Design a protein around this ligand. Structure first.
Ligand code: WGM
Length: 284
């Protein structure tokens, strides 16, 4: 029974290696990674892989791995797929811990924009969880942490992390991680998956997929929002993605809204993540 070597980048930046039978479904690999991580609340998470042009796709746990990675290497990342709108309602601390690791990379990568003060507050809770109580011995007036906190580190930001870290004396790691999450969950781009597109007039927009629905960011005009319960059908055709905005009160007809994506694969990818979010965030 022939087995393929899998390499998975974990949210701590380390590499997990395992083997699965070459005809394995994505769930087989995901179960092995989640067991390695002691993760029970697995529904929020998934595996990604970089495609024949370094774009990230979700590995579908119900489909053969080989029919997804196709000609590419069996190399994956472990990631949050569905960002819980209220992380305090997760059953296990270790789930919150992995969500913190994902958010820390969302912040350093700049996918999750963050004010100076929130960068320093989030950083202060991470230091508290990892190192425990502030120690002056591990920090002179010239201290720079090993912790990556932000897309662009400054001495001012390092100083503000230390100032806030001093305020958290006696805080336990689960407690610090919950405070991290209480702040992060409020950020306007928390759990927003952004996709480049054009409106029906060729004007560049971003479409954001998240728990609360689909976001249109036209930038120069406004930000339109479609709560999932106002969305009846999602579809793609060629390079186009369409959303049927259910007819409101006393309106005769449903309404359909169309977008142009970079290529057909980018339309299919946006359709699949919307369908998955619609399903997941209907069951809350
Ligand atoms: C500053 C934003 C929130 C908006 N945005 C846009 N990018 C290109 C075209 C149009 C846009 F709206 C990037 C980011 O998501």
């Amino acid at each position: 029974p022939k087995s393929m070597q899998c390499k998975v980048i974990l949210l701590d930046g380390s590499e997990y290696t395992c083997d699965v039978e070459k005809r394995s479904r994505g769930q087989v690999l995901f179960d092995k990674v989640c067991e390695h991580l002691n993760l029970l609340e697995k529904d929020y998470f998934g595996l990604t892989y970089r495609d024949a042009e370094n774009q990230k796709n979700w590995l579908d746990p119900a489909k053969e791995i080989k029919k997804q990675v196709r000609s590419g290497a069996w190399h994956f990342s472990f990631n949050v797929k569905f960002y819980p709108p209220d992380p305090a309602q997760l059953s296990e601390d270790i789930t919150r811990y992995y969500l913190c690791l994902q958010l820390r990379d969302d912040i350093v990568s700049g996918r999750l924009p963050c004010s100076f003060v929130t960068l320093a507050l989030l950083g202060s809770y991470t230091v508290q969880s990892e190192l425990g109580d502030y120690d002056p011995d591990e920090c002179g007036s010239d201290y720079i942490s090993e912790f990556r906190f932000a897309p662009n580190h400054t001495k001012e930001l390092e100083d503000k992390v230390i100032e806030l870290h001093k305020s958290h004396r006696g805080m336990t790691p689960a407690e610090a991680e919950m405070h991290f999450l209480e702040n992060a969950k409020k950020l306007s781009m928390y759990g927003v998956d952004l996709h480049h597109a054009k409106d029906s007039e060729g004007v560049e927009i971003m479409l954001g997929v998240c728990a609360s629905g689909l976001l249109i960011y036209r930038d120069r005009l406004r930000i339109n929002r479609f709560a999932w319960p106002k969305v009846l059908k999602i579809s793609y055709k060629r390079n186009n993605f369409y959303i049927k905005i259910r007819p409101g009160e006393f309106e005769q007809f449903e309404s359909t809204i169309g977008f142009k994506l970079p290529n057909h694969r980018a339309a299919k990818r946006l359709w699949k993540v919307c369908v998955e979010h619609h399903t997941f965030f209907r069951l809350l």
